[PDB]
Amino acid sequence: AAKAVAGKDVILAVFNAAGDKLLAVAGQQGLTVNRSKDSIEITSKDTVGGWKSKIGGMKEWSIENDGLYVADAESHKELAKYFESDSPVCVKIINQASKKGLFGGLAIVADYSFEAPFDEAMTYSVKLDGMGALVDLTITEGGDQMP
Amino acid sequence: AAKAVAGKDVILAVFNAAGDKLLAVAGQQGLTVNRSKDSIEITSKDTVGGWKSKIGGMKEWSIENDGLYVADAESHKELAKYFESDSPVCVKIINQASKKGLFGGLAIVADYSFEAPFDEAMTYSVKLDGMGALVDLTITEGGDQMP
Amino acid sequence: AAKAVAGKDVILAVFNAAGDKLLAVAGQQGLTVNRSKDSIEITSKDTVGGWKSKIGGMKEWSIENDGLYVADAESHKELAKYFESDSPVCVKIINQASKKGLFGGLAIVADYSFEAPFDEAMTYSVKLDGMGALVDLTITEGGDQMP
Amino acid sequence: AFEENLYCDYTPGAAKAVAGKDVILAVFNAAGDKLLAVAGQQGLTVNRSKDSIEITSKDTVGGWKSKIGGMKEWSIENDGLYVADAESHKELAKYFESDSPVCVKIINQASKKGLFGGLAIVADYSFEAPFDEAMTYSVKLDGMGALVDLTITEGGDQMP
Amino acid sequence: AFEENLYCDYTPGAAKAVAGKDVILAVFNAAGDKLLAVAGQQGLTVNRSKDSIEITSKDTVGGWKSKIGGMKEWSIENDGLYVADAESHKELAKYFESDSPVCVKIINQASKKGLFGGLAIVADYSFEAPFDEAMTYSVKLDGMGALVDLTITEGGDQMP
Amino acid sequence: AFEENLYCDYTPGAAKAVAGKDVILAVFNAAGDKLLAVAGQQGLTVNRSKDSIEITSKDTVGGWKSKIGGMKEWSIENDGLYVADAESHKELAKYFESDSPVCVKIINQASKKGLFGGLAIVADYSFEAPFDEAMTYSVKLDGMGALVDLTITEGGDQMP
Amino acid sequence: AFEENLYCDYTPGAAKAVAGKDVILAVFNAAGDKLLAVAGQQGLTVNRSKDSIEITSKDTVGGWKSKIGGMKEWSIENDGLYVADAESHKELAKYFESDSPVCVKIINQASKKGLFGGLAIVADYSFEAPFDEAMTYSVKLDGMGALVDLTITEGGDQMP
Amino acid sequence: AFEENLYCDYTPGAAKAVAGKDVILAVFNAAGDKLLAVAGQQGLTVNRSKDSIEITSKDTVGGWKSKIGGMKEWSIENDGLYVADAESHKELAKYFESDSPVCVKIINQASKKGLFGGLAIVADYSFEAPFDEAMTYSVKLDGMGALVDLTITEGGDQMP
Amino acid sequence: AFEENLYCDYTPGAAKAVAGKDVILAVFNAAGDKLLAVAGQQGLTVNRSKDSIEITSKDTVGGWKSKIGGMKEWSIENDGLYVADAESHKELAKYFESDSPVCVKIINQASKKGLFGGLAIVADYSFEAPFDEAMTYSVKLDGMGALVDLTITEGGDQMP
Amino acid sequence: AAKAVAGKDVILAVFNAAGDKLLAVAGQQGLTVNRSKDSIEITSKDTVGGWKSKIGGMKEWSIENDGLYVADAESHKELAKYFESDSPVCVKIINQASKKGLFGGLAIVADYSFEAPFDEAMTYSVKLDGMGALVDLTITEGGDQMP
Amino acid sequence: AAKAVAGKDVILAVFNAAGDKLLAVAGQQGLTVNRSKDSIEITSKDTVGGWKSKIGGMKEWSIENDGLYVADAESHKELAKYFESDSPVCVKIINQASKKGLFGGLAIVADYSFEAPFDEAMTYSVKLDGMGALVDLTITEGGDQMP
Amino acid sequence: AAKAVAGKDVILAVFNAAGDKLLAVAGQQGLTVNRSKDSIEITSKDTVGGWKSKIGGMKEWSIENDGLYVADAESHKELAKYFESDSPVCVKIINQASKKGLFGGLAIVADYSFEAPFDEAMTYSVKLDGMGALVDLTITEGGDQMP
């Protein structure tokens, strides 16, 4: 196999308003994807043993991406438009090395903040909150649009 | 393009009481702009799937700025008046290298505090809470009054 | 005796969908097994002494795992299937040095998250919440299927 | 799911629970040919009560109060998200204004088994519009006659 | 918005939710030519109830209590931030002092569709002045007559 | 405050709020020449209620319950910190023991505009002294007639 | 467990506690041969009350009102997780519809000792299905006669 | 405390607050010569109310309801820590069983001024003993007659 | 404990507090020879109330209602952990079923002083078994006559 | 101007009991002045836009000063009396180099704590909670009594 | 005197199920004996002064022990049985250098978790919650059984 | 003056049961004295200004003391007796260099724990919570017994 995938090869990609171009957000430096599921309590004391009973609940997901900020790139000119208009955004995760998509979904820009240290470059941070199903493209055929 | 914006060129500017001067806050050493949106829950389980559904909620913004404190400069004697008079203040974010405005809005001085360590220079911290819309000047035409 | 067990010799393994193959989670780098019990307070102050009285409650367990992520790994292609289908999953802990099983049980994939730096390899994290009893195999006879 | 099920007991002998995301309230349309699930559902409560008449006779040994059972009533409350365009809510309003009996059913949409069917009356059709929330609706149905239990009676599996 | 909607589905088939910031209360002015949106609105409650008369006959097989639907009534509750200078607030006071029946409407200002219009009486017009908050008002309107549902009836879309 | 108000809109077109620290209760002295602000004020509530007389006639088409406007009453709740030697607090007690009507006014200091004036009786003058807090008082006023709304009428703007 | 029990006293002389996971409500089937434990039990409440008749006679020195004991009543409230297919939950419906009295027993399944057995009527068999949890049931039984305390009377220890 | 009080203003013009730790309830002994402060005082509530009589006549212009003041009443509720051997608690019981009126005075021990004196009867003398706390008592006093305030009337300054 | 007690005052001049772990409820057995402390005690509440008769006559100067105290009543509420085999619990049930008055006493087990003795009726004897806790019990006793206060009367200190 | 103020020149001074002597708190090693205001929420959603509305709240202030502790110092025999007597203390902040006062006000000694390491000298910490207005002496005329 | 006691000399010991043997739990590397007493507040402000009156409340204790985990050690084969059976366990803290016992008690295994990093040895952590009195053997005579 | 006080000279001592002997706790390495006062909020907004009004509340104090633990020392054989017997302890903080007492008061032993690290010596920690007045000896005459 590959035995690893270098972190500099997976990127976040945003669909433009018409959906014609998959713009990779410029200045990407970090990325984390959270996928969680709740747990319900079916603990009813008619069962032998001594262990607590649980089942699976609801699933949700989120994405955090931060990096260097340039305000002129078309990718950052779209994130502002989506943020101000409260429109759902289409996000995809691309392994630009193996040329395969990873995870696509609809998200809402929960945060768009950025910092300007005096001895560094102005860095930006983005949080996207999950809106519906996060389609696992590693288990589902298709989803390989490159840009 | 630019591929980056060095942090020593993004500054915070404040409109004076009359509004005729855009005074740059002296002693600036750090700048953080936070922009957040709430996320509402509409999970009703007559919907197929298995992912917890959300929409985007209400938007808010704020600015933190810290640095060296100078007591006699014009800028620092106006933040005192704004804090004391309980008046909204007009704030702007300026890229003093690219000479483009970034974000302007009305803000409230929520925190105006400072520290005087013995073996260092006496530093100040400022927090401004957003009152209403924060205009993204990177997507809107205008907003370039420099000083 | 052994006086110790090297930490690279203890691994986490998962049963496939039909349960005919025990697959070691590819990319394993860390592991933590948490087993906790509740405590009930029975302080009825008709009792001489002066120390607070307690008894035992219910027992829960969970597993934290993390390591390097390989997308094509069939074990990683099965954890996704278990997470998506909300189906209980059979997990086991193997000491590959002594070829002895340690802990097996049914769990729910509560969290399946992964994060990718810019200067490192893409890492993955898994949280498994106990769906009932976790049978310790070091006290009970059996449980030694190796793969 | 193997090793002779030594620690993983996958044997199905019961469910031990029914997730609330699977019990749904359904209403028959005006024609009675289509079962519609009330859209935006988020809660459901079925109350079944029986009156208790006292028959205490003051010439009996003991010291306990004697009681007998009376009549039975049933009611349903259901709240959730309100979408005024859903045809199910375009059906509830017509029943509310027409003062007509309405046919209601409770479906375990995961077990594909009916639970309780009956004829009820829309006693209250109210809803809330918080400024920072989504508009929620509340529905109260008062029973008109017997609530037929489908867990002990055959049939009642019209799924939609 | 592409890849054949493999993961992003924007297809319009419903709303699936109605944000409460999209539903407002509108009041007709005295002359009836201007619909004023009550300024400072923050909460909205609509109550619609029907009684239940019992006709339990002691000669009916079964064991359940028989009923029919009673009289119908309705009411509105509102509350929000109060300014004494707004014209809409300058109309509620006039109606309250004059005992004049007031025409009220519920507007989905997002979908541009009316919901409920009717004549009501201002039963309660109260307000508070908390020292560490903003002075806020609460209004109760008791329904006089039918609550004309605009979701089933055609028309009633005056937005102002 | 400039750039043609491109992002900072300083135009005053309304208040959009009235902070609760601006609405005070004022009481006329015995002579009626001095308006005293009740010292230590921390909370205020004004209740205005109207009764509803039902005229439901069993010969009306429709299906909704008919009601009209009844009689109107009003009351005021105040609470705050109590200092015994304050002139205002030495006057409410006098009105309380003498059972005399007391003239009350609601004043917005920021707008310098009267809101509501009337005659009331102190139906309750109670206060608590928690050990770990400051001793606070509460006053309940019931009004015998017209609560004149100064937001729609001319005059009545005395500040004290 | 040793060192002459210097710091560890394992001596059994009482229970000093009875965990709630050891008290089970059980029901006799229609035939009366099978004792079924109500599946999904999560809470239990036993209420036993007596009335108090007053005999305050004014010709008695003192100043305290005199009372005696009235009649005795008892009831059981039990709530928990609900599965419709369970055998115990299927008799409760049959008992509830048939008005038939039900024999109920409360058992310390850890001590294998009966506590309270008697006849009761199912006054309420209601249940709720929240959308974000498992659907739960609640049961109320009112006692028609004596509740025999098995802790002071010999017998009554059937385990199922 | 200087620089012409440029920033530090001590100048006494009021108290602006009265700490609750300075307000203590005290009772007169049976002989009436010793004023004892109830030990363990932790809470105090002095309620004073006046009834309202309605004089609504259907021939009055306006549109509001007419009322006057009725009869007045007062009561005191004091709770705190309880010790059995204190003289104050060894005097309250003597009043309680003997059903004798007790003279009560509420005193500001800081300003050395009395506030309210009266004659009351212990209508409720209860106390609580939580296991993980100190045992707490509560007292309710109902007055027979006038509650003479000492803030408007001269005198009543005996401290003990 | 020294340096002339300059900062450490070890002189006992009062208690200033009585922890609730030192106040227990004890009952007399059927023979009346053993004082048994209720096992599993965790709470205790003693209520002592007195009625108030109004004697307001409409020819009295003032404005306050005239009141005189009526009859006196007392009651006790206890709760805590329940163990079935405890002797005190095997005595309480016998009194509950037999309608026999029980002699009850409140004991300060630290100071070895009796507090209150009386005769009571077990009005309520209920207990709960939450699934994630220990089975708890609650007892209500209503007094048939005078509750003898032992803090004012000499005697009554039988400790067990 | 000065472009900065050295931190070893900002000191805290306390008025004595009679108010005749402004004592510099002996042992000063640090100083922090916090000034905060609250924020009221006035979101009325009959207003177009999409950004959250706020107004000015309630203002308060506090000071924390820490350093080395000398018990026999006159200033440390005054703080103890104020702390024990529950009396307001008049505090002032001095730029002892520029001979200009900064802020004066009445405060309550909320905390007076001190810690004594084994291998270092005995240090003390003081917290003063503001009772009312913190008068700024930089935008107001006067207030320059040095001692 | 000794003026110190080495930390490699204090050990935790467990009485087995029969109680005939005192087991030194293998792999010990850390101990923590926490003993706390609650405080009840008796502030009644009829008392002169100005300080908050308190009394002593209820007492409790707990033990934390972490170290290397060798599963085959028969000492660990008793901790597992106690954890699974919810039976109280007799615990003694022993100074193997002075040959004196310190603290005996009846405790419950409230937490039994362990960690397996790939670059270290498998470490285990155990929490024991006190069910009643912790007998201090330093004051009381007896309690000197080592094994 | 002194301008400083060495931390190795501020030492904690407690009184024995009879109170005839002042014993310094053997093995102490640290000491912390906390003295706190509450603050009520009395903002009545009929007042001009714009700041928040506060008065002082109740006062209470506490002591933290940790160091090396030696069991045979008589002083540690007195703290254990107090902790077991729930009796108040008279504690005094003295300056063994200037032979001056600082603070005396009654306290309860709220927390008496200790650590046994593998590569260190056994260390102990003590928390004392006072019931009422902590009389400071630096402003009052007396309290000067060293032993």
XYZ file of C-alpha atoms in Angstrom, chain C residues 40-95:
56
model
C -23.369 5.702 45.432
C -23.484 7.687 48.685
C -25.341 6.043 51.574
C -24.584 8.485 54.369
C -27.444 8.091 56.832
C -26.274 9.971 59.885
C -27.488 7.512 62.501
C -24.078 5.829 62.177
C -21.269 6.442 64.648
C -17.809 7.137 63.316
C -17.252 10.087 61.015
C -16.402 8.718 57.564
C -18.696 9.045 54.560
C -20.173 5.747 53.359
C -20.258 4.610 49.739
C -21.175 1.557 47.661
C -20.717 0.483 44.046
C -22.763 1.571 41.067
C -22.570 0.597 37.399
C -19.551 -0.155 35.214
C -18.788 1.457 31.859
C -15.874 1.178 29.449
C -14.485 2.900 26.374
C -11.464 2.845 24.070
C -9.415 5.718 22.657
C -7.197 4.962 19.667
C -5.159 7.146 17.330
C -2.439 6.830 14.741
C -1.554 7.292 11.105
C -4.370 7.136 8.560
C -4.345 5.087 5.355
C -7.515 5.498 3.312
C -7.338 2.201 1.408
C -6.936 0.052 4.540
C -9.751 -2.501 4.722
C -9.884 -2.097 8.501
C -10.255 1.649 7.900
C -12.759 0.706 5.175
C -14.718 -1.221 7.820
C -14.679 1.311 10.654
C -16.330 3.743 8.242
C -19.003 1.162 7.402
C -19.667 0.497 11.087
C -19.810 4.224 11.842
C -22.226 4.936 8.991
C -24.646 2.049 9.594
C -24.921 2.674 13.365
C -24.315 -1.034 13.882
C -22.628 -2.465 16.993
C -19.044 -3.541 16.355
C -16.990 -6.305 17.960
C -13.586 -5.086 19.162
C -10.709 -7.021 20.722
C -7.340 -6.144 22.252
C -4.424 -8.386 21.303
C -1.019 -8.839 22.901
